[PDB]
Design a protein around this nucleic acid. Structure first.
Ligand SMILES: [Zn+2]
Lengths: 70, 65, 69, 78, 233, 75, 82, 73, 81, 135
RNA sequence: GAGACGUCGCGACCCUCGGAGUCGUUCUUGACUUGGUCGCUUGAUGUUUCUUCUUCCCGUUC
RNA sequence: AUACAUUUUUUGGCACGGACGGGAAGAG
């Protein structure tokens, strides 16, 4: 029953982490679209599971994304 | 605002234009990278007045208050 | 727009040469306009099978070279 | 070389061509595309191993635009 | 005259048939009309490590070098800064080559030697004097009470060091100064151009560019010129 | 013929051990159960497990792996 | 809305261009396609620590061009009008 | 066009043609196969006819790669 | 529509050569081609990027991963152009 | 009839049987060819010395038949029917060259002419249309 | 610098031996077909693993 | 005569006396 887009929608205003094409991320999701571009707050940059820096307010481009996770 | 990029270029710059592709016209442009030989540690950055940018390059844009 | 004419290769074992210098084998069961492949399961090239049936994405295929003539 | 506006207007000129892999295709542009694919009349792939120019004559070549980087004019027509 | 074509197409003599100005002047210079300083505005942005500086504010900076004292006592940057001295070198070289480029007919060697002698006999000899602070030194960037202490300072280890390290830069600065003075009319002309283009619209700027281009890629002698149409008086 | 979409649907219906390969990434694989379906190859896959490939096992939660970086499916 | 339009409007500009492979390209933009395929004239190719190679005409593809370094003087707001 | 025969057929085709071009360029601006039928022969084509006649008379029996070539129109 | 595509189609039957992104040249009779250069070929040799060669029967290739295609020089004559 | 820029610009240009230019007392002003030719045909002219060339990276074949070459200041050099008379005049070719032809030059009849060329210009593989052999 | 694995060459005791072409219809077109082996006695070239000095000669540059 | 970015193209999986050259000999 649960498709991806609705899951994504649900997960707005909640913690998420993103891997890339590689470095892990960690932040609260602000909003999403059809193309799967992201906008996050309280972004922390997990360099292979090592929080290098806390950027805060960020916007991730879709094509570099690998997966979403809580 | 600062932008992370595919080729390891931290683009600190003033945004002018914006579109579907996340291409950007940029003023007050200050890129940050590192030209290095193996076992070489150098940190380089250059000022540019006006600069167009392509969107596939962009990984993550960010805003430092 | 047009369908990939792989009706010749239907129900035959094919070497799906796939992205990153890898390989797959298996009998061809189906496909679509994007060239995704649905195939009965076989090994990844010494050798080890995973799965009962398998689905390969379109983008990933370098080649699908026919094992059977 | 002349001072053209577009690629289409300079049809059948001898062309240097660069591709993402680093090879250099040289030959006369017979036909262009919506996606910059090129037909080349007498095509020669020229490659450089990591020294000096290695050379291969191909012939009539359809060249995909994905792999094309940039095109340059080698000479005039004929 | 006209030694190249069949009859009358090229003013150039057979002697200099392969003489081409476009290989000496860029399009933005318009054969000496303007001097292209945008490039140096770029490099300058790279030098100041910011963007607070506009093309016009940069030209405002250059103006300092028209004065005999400003470029020395009110420097854009600290005159002992590396980036700055390098920039100044490149710029100076440009201005000089432009100068002699735009005035072929004047004896280059004469001018060079004149400037050099002015540099040795006056500039480095306390040419800058103030009734209050005394005598300024380009190399040490310090003043001096009287000429006496000034002279006995020109043998000191400090001044030896400096005059021995920053000589080329000081000299280049000076050249930038005097050559920019000799080109005041061109400097003004360009600054004007800048303000104009700046106050254009899109179509306007485009048509203007078209004009500069045409002037650049046009025959020096048209098939439709006059020969022997002299008026009297 | 059995289309890919149909296969995906079947898998979803089942809820079976799915082992996904990554595009242009040999060393890593995913192992879970398909929950979602999209017009593209993208899906959501709860109870996923990241795997380092034999040239063990690693902890991982619920994930949607993006359609562009998929390679293999099996279910 | 469109940056394509803006690009088109930029005509006859002597500009540097930067590629995905880092090649610095000094040339006069005679035209650009709807898909960013740059057509230069009076072109000068340099790498990012080695010697220069100059060329008369270069048609560079849109996918390659990372960053077009714009001219010194430019009114951007005006350009951005439809 | 001049027809040459009695040529050393051991020379590779591309080398034969390039030496033929070189040798015959001296008379004016200038087809050879290795089939059984055509081996040891070549057709050399010149822009000018006077060039062909001069070539024929001056190189009759010229030692080329060891053998005396025989030329004819 | 693309004239290169047309050319490719025409080359059907003929012995085309064909390199990929990988750099693995093939030569063979072109069986079928599509708008997207989704080529099939018969009786096809396959060179590795390093050097070694391998004979093979009926290769399929997806145009995405194709780099350049060499067609025989008779087609320069017509009839597409 | 000086070899001039104007002369080179109206000269027949074609693909030979390589890109070749069809061409004088003195070799000069080659700059104007812009290094665009693989071959240059200077046959039947009055050149005295093979000299005066600009840097030409393309140029691989020089056909210099029936001129008056008596001194020398590149893979193939055809000098048939010229005026080279002393073995020592051929010395400058050591600094280049695989195909060399010097037939119909007085130098040809000098004792040991062939062996002299072989030792002084070892890079030559074919001399006067005959294979340089090991023996 | 050395070991594969290929791909195109100097010699030979060897082998081997002599766009074009045809037709239907009409004053010009449409169809159908189409060097190999051994050495190198130090030939040329990619992949792919591992680990330079001294002397003499010939050429460029300052 | 009255025109647009989510698998096949262009939103990319990209990136990290002194030198020089050749040839020969002798040593490790
Ligand atoms: Zn002092």
């Amino acid at each position: 029953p649960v498709n991806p887009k609705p899951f994504l929608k649900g997960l707005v205003n909640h913690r998420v982490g993103v891997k890339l094409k590689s470095t892990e991320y960690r932040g609260t999701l602000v909003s999403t679209d059809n193309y799967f571009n992201l906008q996050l707050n309280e972004a922390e940059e997990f360099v292979a599971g090592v929080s290098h820096g806390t950027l805060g307010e960020i916007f991730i481009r879709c094509n570099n994304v690998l997966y979403i996770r809580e | 605002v600062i932008i992370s990029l595919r080729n390891n270029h931290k683009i600190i710059a003033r945004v002018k234009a914006f579109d579907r592709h996340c291409n950007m016209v940029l003023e007050n442009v200050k890129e940050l990278w590192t030209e290095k030989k193996g076992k070489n540690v150098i940190n380089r950055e250059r000022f540019i007045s006006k600069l167009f940018l392509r969107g596939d390059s962009v990984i993550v844009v960010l805003k430092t208050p | 727009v047009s369908t990939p004419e792989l009706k010749k290769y239907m129900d035959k074992k094919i070497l799906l040469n796939i992205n990153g210098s890898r390989k797959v084998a298996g009998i061809l069961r189906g496909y679509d306009i994007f060239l995704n492949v649905v195939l009965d399961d076989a090994m990844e090239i010494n050798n080890h099978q995973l799965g009962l049936q398998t689905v390969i994405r379109g983008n990933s295929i370098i080649s699908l070279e026919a094992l059977d003539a | 070389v002349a001072h053209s506006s577009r690629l289409a207007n300079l049809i059948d000129y001898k062309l240097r061509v660069l591709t993402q892999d680093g090879r250099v295709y040289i030959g006369q542009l017979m036909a262009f595309d919506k996606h910059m694919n090129l037909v080349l009349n007498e095509c020669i792939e020229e490659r450089v191993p990591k020294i000096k120019v290695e050379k291969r004559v191909l012939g009539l070549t359809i060249l995909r635009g994905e792999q094309i980087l940039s095109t340059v004019v080698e000479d005039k027509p004929l | 005259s006209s030694s190249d074509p069949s009859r009358r197409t090229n003013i150039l003599s057979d002697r200099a048939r392969d003489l081409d100005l476009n290989e000496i002047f860029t399009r933005d210079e318009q054969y000496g009309e303007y001097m292209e300083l945008e490039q140096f505005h770029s490099l300058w942005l790279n030098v100041i490590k910011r963007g607070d500086c506009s093309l016009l504010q940069f030209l405002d900076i250059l103006e300092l070098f028209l004065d005999d004292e400003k470029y020395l006592l009110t420097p854009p940057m600290d005159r002992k800064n590396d980036r700055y001295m390098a920039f100044l070198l490149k710029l100076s070289k440009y201005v000089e080559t432009f100068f002699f480029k735009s005035y072929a007919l004047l004896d280059a060697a004469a001018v060079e030697n004149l400037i050099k002698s002015d540099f040795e006999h006056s500039y480095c000899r306390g040419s800058l004097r103030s009734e209050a602070k005394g005598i300024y030194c380009p190399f040490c960037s310090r003043w001096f009470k009287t000429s006496s202490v000034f002279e006995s300072h020109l043998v000191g280890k400090i001044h030896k060091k400096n005059e021995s390290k920053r000589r080329n830069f000081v000299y280049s600065e000076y050249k930038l100064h005097r050559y920019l003075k000799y080109l005041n009319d061109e400097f003004s002309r360009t600054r004007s151009f800048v303000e104009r283009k700046l106050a254009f619209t899109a179509n306007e700027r485009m048509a203007e560019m078209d004009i500069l281009t045409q002037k650049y890629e046009a025959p020096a002698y048209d098939s439709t010129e006059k020969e022997g149409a002299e008026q009297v008086d | 013929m059995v289309p890919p979409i149909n296969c995906i649907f079947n898998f979803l219906q089942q809820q079976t051990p799915v082992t996904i390969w990554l595009f242009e990434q040999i060393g890593i694989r995913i192992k879970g159960k398909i929950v979602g379906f999209d017009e593209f190859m993208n899906v959501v896959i709860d109870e996923a497990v990241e795997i380092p490939v034999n040239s063990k096992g690693t902890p991982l939660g619920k994930i949607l792996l993006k359609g562009d970086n998929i390679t293999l499916i099996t279910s | 809305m469109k940056l394509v339009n803006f690009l088109k409007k930029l005509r006859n500009e002597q500009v540097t261009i930067e590629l995905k492979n880092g090649t610095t390209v000094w040339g006069t933009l005679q035209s650009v396609s709807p898909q960013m395929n740059a057509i230069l004239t009076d072109v000068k190719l340099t790498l990012p620590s080695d010697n220069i190679a100059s060329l008369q005409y270069i048609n560079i593809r849109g996918n390659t061009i990372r960053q077009i370094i714009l001219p010194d003087s430019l009114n951007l707001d005006s350009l951005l009008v439809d | 066009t001049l027809y040459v025969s009695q040529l050393n057929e051991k020379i590779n085709m591309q080398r034969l043609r390039v030496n033929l071009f070189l040798l015959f360029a001296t008379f004016g601006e200038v087809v050879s196969m290795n089939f059984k039928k055509q081996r040891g022969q070549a057709f050399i084509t010149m822009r000018t006819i006077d060039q062909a006649s001069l070539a024929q008379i001056s190189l009759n029996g010229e030692r080329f790669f060891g053998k005396p070539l025989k030329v004819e129109f | 529509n693309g004239i290169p595509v047309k050319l490719l189609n025409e080359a059907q039957g003929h012995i085309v050569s064909l390199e990929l992104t990988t750099g693995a040249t093939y030569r063979g009779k072109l069986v079928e081609s599509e708008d997207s250069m989704n080529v099939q070929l018969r009786d096809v040799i396959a060179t590795e990027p390093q050097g070694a060669v391998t004979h093979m029967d009926q290769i399929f290739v997806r145009g995405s991963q194709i780099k350049f295609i060499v067609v025989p020089d008779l087609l320069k004559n017509a009839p597409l152009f | 009839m000086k070899f001039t820029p104007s002369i080179v610009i109206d000269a027949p240009q074609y693909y030979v049987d390589d890109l070749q230019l069809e061409t004088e007392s003195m070799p000069s002003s080659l700059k104007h060819l812009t290094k665009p030719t693989h071959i240059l045909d200077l046959t039947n002219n009055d050149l005295i010395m093979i000299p005066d060339l600009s840097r030409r990276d393309d140029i691989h074949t020089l056909l210099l038949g029936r001129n008056n070459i008596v001194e020398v200041d590149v893979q193939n050099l055809t000098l048939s029917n010229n005026s080279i008379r002393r073995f020592e005049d051929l010395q400058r070719l050591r600094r280049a060259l695989k195909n060399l032809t010097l037939i119909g030059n007085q130098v040809c009849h000098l004792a040991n002419y062939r062996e002299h060329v072989l030792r002084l210009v070892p890079h030559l593989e074919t001399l006067d249309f005959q294979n340089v052999t090991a023996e």
